[PDB]
């Protein structure tokens, strides 16, 4: 669905139309923001350390692994999503690309079914 590109500092460089629909931030609003604006606390507070940690250590926790996370929308409502990260690099700098699958639908069916 969503695609998003950050600099090695977690600043949003690119923001696809999907993500716009997914998160409810227009591309402009979104560009030049910290990516943490898309998650809840406590994650939202740590995200930078998530990044400085990987930079100095080169140990991947999501990169090439993938994970299921809670994402936060603009109007504050949260959701699950599968998150994948790609490391590229341009202008000598490392750039990260997030691909996002919304899982709201699956989680809700699974709840509904559990409930019945």
Q: Which residues bind ligand HEM (CB under 6 A)?
A: 4, 6, 35, 38-39, 43, 47, 50-51, 54, 60-63, 69-71, 83, 85, 96-98
Give the nearest distance from C-beta 93 to ligand HEM in angstroms: 13
Q: Is 47 annotated as a binding residue?
A: yes
Residue 77 CA neighbour count, 13 Å, CB half: 5
Give the nearest distance from C-beta 116 to ligand HEM in angstroms: 30
Question: Per the structure block, which two tokens stand in for 9?
Answer: 């500092």
In the bound state with ligand HEM, the residue whose beta carbon lies nearer, of 25 and 85, is 85
Q: Which residue has the tokens 């999503």?
A: 81
In the bound state with ligand HEM, the residue whose beta carbon lies nearer, of 100 and 115, is 100
In the bound state with ligand HEM, the residue whose beta carbon lies nearer, of 53 and 112, is 53
d(Cα 106, Cα 35) in Å, to the nearest integer?
Answer: 25
SS3 readout for 10-39: CEEEEECHHHHHHHCCCHHHHCCCEHHHHC
Q: Please state the residue numbers annotated as binding site for heme.
A: 47
């Amino acid at each position: 669905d969503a695609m998003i590109v950050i600099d090695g500092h977690g600043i949003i460089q690119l923001f696809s139309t999907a993500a716009e629909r997914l998160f409810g931030w227009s591309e402009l609003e979104a560009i030049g923001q910290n990516v943490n604006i898309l998650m809840p606390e406590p994650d939202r507070s740590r995200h930078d350390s998530y990044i400085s940690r990987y930079r100095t250590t080169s140990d991947p926790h999501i990169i090439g692994i993938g994970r299921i996370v809670t994402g936060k929308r603009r109007d504050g409502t949260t959701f699950p999503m599968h998150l994948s990260i790609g490391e590229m690099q341009s202008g000598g700098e490392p750039y990260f690309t997030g691909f996002v699958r919304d899982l709201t639908e699956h989680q809700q069916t699974q709840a509904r079914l559990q409930e019945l």
